[model samples]
Target: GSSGSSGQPTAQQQLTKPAKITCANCKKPLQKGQTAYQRKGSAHLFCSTTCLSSFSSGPSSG
Candidate 1:
């Protein structure tokens, strides 16, 4: 069976998928179910809570 020229995604295409989590500061990949500090309407991934401290604080000192 085929539907022609609808130009819309099917039901299978509508399924939601999770976004890739990465550190906002270091741009490092994060693991699933791990603690990530979220800010500015996005998930700021971090390997540790301590890392989140300096990251969300401000821009690079250098």
Candidate 2:
């Protein structure tokens, strides 16, 4: 089977279905109905807008 031949769904596609979303900044699990920001198909779930700002500031560090 040639798995490479088949096109994979974009990150946006995954959003349509039930998914375990997390914060792009803190990596915290985001529950449904929480505030979030979406960019380039990736959802950045945040506890608050302040967190969202932090996410935009820079990438996540280990």
Would you list the C-alpha lDDT of every candidate in the order shown?
A: 0.66, 0.67
Off by over 4 Å in 1: 1-19, 40-45, 56-62
Cα distance off (Å), candidate 2, residue 32 = 1.7
Pairs with steric clashes in candidate 2: none
RMSD of each: 10.4, 8.6
Cα shift from native, residue 35, model 1 (Å)? 1.5
Pairs of residues at least 3 apart in sequence or in different chains that clash in candidate 1: none
| lDDT (tens digit, per residue) of candidate 1 on 13-53 | 65386567777667777877777776556545566666666
Q: Write the per-residue lDDT of candidate 2 for residues 1-62, one digit (tens) a residue.
A: 55565687665434556457777678788777877776666644566666777767555582
Most lDDT-accurate candidate: 2
Q: Report the C-alpha displacement of residue 6, candidate 2, in angstroms.
A: 26
